[PDB]
Ligand binder design. Structure first.
Ligand code: NA
Lengths: 237, 218, 239, 218, 237, 60
């Protein structure tokens, strides 16, 4: 156990469980001989790259699961959201740290994964004859994230049983309370629109449901802390 | 001991039937002796789910045109297969000047000659095609649309100023080649509803596979 | 000119001939590929990745589908009771259908190799007990009781000591050809069985739940392979 | 002085007629413009006894399709020869989606084009095909059945949605190549009764060869 | 003349006539880099590999011939049959020793051969219009072996006059009373089912009929003694 | 292109021509051959093996 600091942000955490480096690649920068070498892309350091701890979610027996979209999740939040909006192009990596706080008498297991291009789908009017399209509140939910309505198919017609094919980590209350994942910038272009395109989604779903006996705190806190890594912005507005 | 059959190239090889153009004499269907087929790799049923095992892909395609009458008969008819690349105007009539625009590669061939065959390069302005795009192109109806995936269009037609003496059919086969893919994802487990999105029938959400009576009885 | 004789096969179009054809846009220069993380080069990579095995493929009720991802162990159960059982049949209908491995087997005709199934106990930290996980090779029939199951290949798993445990299915081979109804399939017969038994009862102190769940993850080992591509699916592009 | 003509390859060379598919216009026979021919090397009468001189064999095959009308006439008709490999579902109708399944190699050819020709590999999951199997696959009717000898099936048909204007016939020739054999055995000396077993007519057990009046009179 | 022992089994035999090694190959084992290297195939030594002497057959003037199926012949017999049944896969070679006991006043000649994949055929109802199939008692006769009904065609439509194309040896009473044949494991797979597939048959047929004068023992004993060589079993049940 | 002249015999199918033809399954890898005892490579081997001569080919 030891507490780390980046700028003015300080989180208390355990020495070092096993971190997961998405696709074995560390988030890196983009070198000079690139498409936009005229408009030098400023690489924020100071405050922009630090610990952002979002509103804790409460895990319940009934909870189906939550997901957040990146970079959307921070585009509203502080000085990162500052750059995310008034800059034409963006690229960046992320350190994601999902932590729980529960007693040795609580039980359950969360699957924490990162899915690039997490396109959401709708129920299509139930009968599937309605070509309905997900709302903006569902597509880009902000820092509060959004709750899954049909986890089994990840609200998108795909088996969550296979979600482990993506960078992921398990949070099994009887053995660990935190998961850490490093995501490199993943896209078909070197730079892209921070507000229009969400490069990936953060999924945290209960596979083994929360449980405890009557009298124990009934809601367990899932706290997402995340820090940008090697972020770059271009074209100020 | 070998593993060649499980390589991406192996998995995506073979020429499948992706399109079928009908050029009837009398009819409601394609009444102008011509047809415009926008290239859709999804034409082969089975393809959608397979390519969607990945997020980003890159490849070339070999197109083969097998033409005949609806009875499989071979007739003395000259045809024109024109490839109008993305960004180019497609023909709107049997007499459109598009059919004559040099920058739209055309192959002229006889129904008697063996199938025509050509190669189409990776067209995207992006580094790779991508089956999923979580965003909007600069609630909405534009969600998930990656336009930079247009491969082009094939405009088919019998040659000549006068309608063809014969009823025809052109089948388009496509073979993917030089395949590369990134970011694997869970395999579709609910039936598809629309070509453009992952929408699933929320009433009929079925379990990924078969079920049984009890977990203790095989 | 140069003397030639056309041979049979001339003019044919073989859907699987991988020859070369004239380029439509000879001067076009495709945008260059850049580096995208996570490239896959051989499906076998995915086959080796563990995914959830729906051992509990029983409930079909839409709102209970998530329950198939985990099976329970409880106080109620008595020492010796059979907990769950399933066969090692990646390509056939059943639990493996949920696994990415099972799904990929569906795009092939034959295959073989070792498998691996990891069981994750997700009960309370305060909960303790022992389970006997057993593998009965092909041919062998599900053990009458814990006692006999113990005589075979097995693992005594103390979920008090370790939270996960991995079993290795030494070998499965879907090669024996069959010609039943009128449809010729290439089925197993190499159905080895994995049976899970309560060795001890589920032990827990006051305040700890009396039911816990086990999640099963599975994947093929490195010696796994597949042959004969076979495109098949019920999920096809719509009209 | 030479001995090449007595090598196994020599003994088993040549393309023999193994199959004949009839596609009549009016008729009881193959009424759906298609036919499924499971590959049977026994199609050439003479073959059975020859391969059965050995217990285990391994080889490739070159298949040649000679098509015409029953008068040997050549007509402007397009055909489809689809090879559905062992383990794959054969078509059940002229409109089966099997005809379109990419993993079933198909060759499209005109009756006017010279014979189609393709090569089929050693398909067995076993190290070799075997004409004799003293056992049962995991009194019985399954005795002597080695299933792992399936080479695949050829599904033949005229192309098109509408029936062909012409009455056709497709003759299938097979040339064995790269032959290897093991464990020679006595050559069949009693007539065959059933394709699948060695049963012999117990009433009509004839002597291996010709007889004479006395052992002292030539 | 000298008596040899393997384990607790001891047979009295003559120094060493000519043994026949089927196809010039000695029965050997199957090395580590094989299909089943995970489930190490135990290679029985102790008692499993020893002398099994089966019920003696009585050769008569009328005798048409006998045959036995391997490994079927021992699957019932003792500790080999033990392994043969409760093991999923099997491979093995064999030493076969066929011996007669007759006076210098008896006469006859037996042809002893080994035929891999000895598939039996039926008379097919006489007229040959009945697609009848051999019984299990005929197909896999046990240690008592089975008697040929139509030797000329080896109960399978093939000329016994050509049986010499198979590993064989002659027992001509006026010159020898025993034949010995070594059979290597012969099959299209490295391992196979011991109870479902009979890799080969042992044929012993009188070509020159038994004969003797009135008063001499009228039935001559054919005694088959056989020992497994380099046997392997896999997957216990 | 490259100048060519088709010669007589063009398009014929000779049952004994041992040419090469397109492979139906180009990616298929046939199970490997293992060693089987008793391989025969030339019929003459069998010809040299003694078999019974029915000198007495009389009774039928
Ligand atoms: Na000339």
């Amino acid at each position: 156990v030891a507490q780390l600091t980046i700028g003015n942000s300080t989180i208390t955490t355990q020495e070092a469980a096993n971190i997961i480096v998405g696709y074995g690649e560390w988030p890196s920068y983009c070198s000079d001989s690139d498409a936009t070498a005229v408009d030098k892309p400023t690489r924020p350091d100071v405050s922009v790259n630090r610990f952002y701890t979002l509103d804790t979610k409460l895990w319940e027996k009934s909870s189906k699961g939550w997901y957040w979209k990146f970079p959307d999740v921070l585009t509203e939040t502080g000085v990162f959201g500052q750059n995310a909006q008034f800059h034409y192009l963006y690229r960046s990596g992320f350190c994601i740290h999902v932590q729980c706080n529960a007693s040795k008498f609580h039980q359950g297991a969360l699957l924490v994964a990162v899915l690039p291009e997490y396109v959401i789908g709708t129920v299509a009017g139930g009968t599937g004859t309605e070509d309905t399209h997900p709302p903006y509140k569902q597509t880009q939910p902000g820092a509060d994230g959004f709750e899954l309505q049909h986890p089994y198919v990840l609200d998108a017609g795909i088996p969550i049983s296979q979600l482990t094919v993506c960078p992921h980590q398990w949070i099994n209350l009887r053995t660990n309370n935190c998961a850490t994942i490093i995501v490199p910038y993943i896209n078909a272009l070197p730079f892209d629109s921070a507000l229009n395109h969400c490069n990936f989604g953060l999924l945290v779903v209960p596979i083994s449901p929360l449980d405890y006996d009557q009298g124990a705190t009934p809601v367990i806190p899932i706290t997402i802390t995340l820090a940008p890594m090697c972020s770059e912005f271009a074209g100020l507005r | 001991h070998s593993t060649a059959e499980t390589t991406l190239d192996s998995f995506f090889s073979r020429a499948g039937l992706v399109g079928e153009i009908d050029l009837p004499l009398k009819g409601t269907t394609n009444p102008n002796g011509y047809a415009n087929w926008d290239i859709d790799i999804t034409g082969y049923a089975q393809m959608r789910r397979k390519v969607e095992l990945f997020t980003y892909m890159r490849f070339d395609a070999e197109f083969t045109f097998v033409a005949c009458t609806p009875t499989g008969e071979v007739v003395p008819q000259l045809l024109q297969y024109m490839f109008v690349p993305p960004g180019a105007p497609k023909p709107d009539s049997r007499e459109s000047l598009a059919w004559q625009t040099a920058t739209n590669p055309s192959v002229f061939v006889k129904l008697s000659d063996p199938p025509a065959q050509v190669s189409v390069p990776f067209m995207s302005p992006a580094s790779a095609y991508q089956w999923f795009y979580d965003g909007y192109p600069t609630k909405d109806l534009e969600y998930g649309a990656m336009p930079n995936n247009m491969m082009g269009t094939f405009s088919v037609r019998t040659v000549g100023t006068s309608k063809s003496k014969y009823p025809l059919v052109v089948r388009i086969y496509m073979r993917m080649k030089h395949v590369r893919a990134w970011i694997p994802r869970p395999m579709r487990n609910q039936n598809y509803l629309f070509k453009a999105n992952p929408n699933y029938a929320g009433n009929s959400i079925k379990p990924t596979g078969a079920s049984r009576t009890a977990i203790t009885t095989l | 000119g140069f003397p030639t004789e056309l041979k049979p096969g001339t003019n044919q179009f073989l859907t699987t001939d991988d020859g070369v054809s004239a380029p439509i846009l000879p001067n076009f220069h495709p945008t260059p590929c850049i580096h995208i993380p996570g490239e896959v080069r051989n499906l076998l990579e995915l086959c080796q990745v563990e995914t959830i095995l729906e051992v509990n493929n029983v409930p079909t009720n839409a709102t209970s589908l998530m329950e198939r991802l985990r099976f329970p162990v409880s106080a109620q159960a008595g020492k010796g009771e059979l907990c769950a059982v399933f066969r090692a049949d990646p390509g056939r209908n059943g639990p493996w259908q949920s696994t990415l491995l099972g799904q990929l087997c569906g795009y092939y005709t034959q295959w073989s190799g070792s498998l691996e199934v990891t069981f994750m106990f997700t009960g309370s930290f305060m909960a303790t007990g022992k389970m006997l996980i057993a593998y009965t090779p092909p041919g062998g029939p599900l053990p009458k009781d814990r006692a006999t199951a113990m005589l075979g290949t097995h693992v005594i798993w103390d979920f008090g000591l370790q939270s996960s445990v991995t079993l290795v299915i030494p070998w499965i081979s879907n090669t024996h050809y069959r010609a039943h109804a009128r449809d010729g399939v290439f089925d197993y017969y190499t159905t080895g069985l994995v049976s899970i038994w309560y060795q001890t009862n589920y032990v827990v102190p006051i305040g700890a739940p009396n039911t816990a769940y086990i999640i099963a993850l599975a994947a093929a080992q490195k010696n796994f392979t597949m042959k004969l591509c076979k495109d098949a699916s019920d999920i096809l592009q719509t009209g």
